[PDB]
């Protein structure tokens with residue numbers, strides 16, 4: 001769940 | 012007088028609040044594009060999705076945010092997104108920012124499939140808050156403060172959030188006492204918005220449903236942050 005949010009948070 | 016340990020916070024924060032920014036190629040569309048209910052909506056969608064990216068970046072840079080439970084970061088992000096947007100848009104209308112085309116942008120908002128029940132309160136909020144003559148720092152602090160709200164739904168360590176929010180509130184208050192010695196109730200007026208903003212989440216969830224049933228096009232990002240199947 002929340003692929004995009006997590007991703008942005010890790011970039 | 013503001014402390015050193017505080018003046019450093021406000022600066023790092025004030026720093027982030029001006030670092031990122033919405034692309035001119037996008038913001039120009041408030042002006043150029045045609046003015047139809049479809050084009051208006053599409054542009055408004057574009058704005059939201061990009062802002063969401065700016066929010067994450069900003070929020071991340073918030074002191075201590077990253078030490079938080081990852082499940083709590085999502086909850087905070089998904090919880091303050093809309094409220095942050097209202098503030099940014101308020102600022103736009105209020106500061107009459109050039110890259111805002113306020114009048115035109117209000118045009119597109121007024122005609123994007125938004126129910127009247129929602130448009131009115133939306134702008135009333137805009138008018139009353141504008142009349143607070145907020146300094147960019149006030150907007151910035153209320154934002155960070157909006158983002159770091161402990162009492163957000165689905166939050167595990169609400170105590171951990173408070174610990175992050177308290178420091179900002181005071182910085183905001185300290186400033187209120189400094190630049191607004193004449194009027195003591197300013198700070199409390201600022202906090203009032205926090206409540207006004209909350210009100211809008213109920214409304215927003217409604218509009219999402221409305222648009223949704225009308226096969227309205229959102230984005231993978233917006234759908235995520237706002238839980239839309």
Ligand SMILES: CC(C)c1onc(-c2c(Cl)cccc2Cl)c1COc1ccc(-c2ccc3c(C(=O)O)cccc3c2)cc1
Pocket residue numbers: 031032033038052055056058059062092093096097099100103110111120123133233
């Ligand atoms: C999905 C779409 C259709 C949508 O649904 N509800 C809304 C809505 C509305 Cl109508 C009113 C209040 C809150 C929300 Cl959430 C929106 C559109 O929501 C938005 C969100 C953000 C911006 C924006 C942010 C920053 C900037 C900046 C800058 O600060 O860099 C510069 C220039 C323009 C800028 C515009 C505009 C509209």
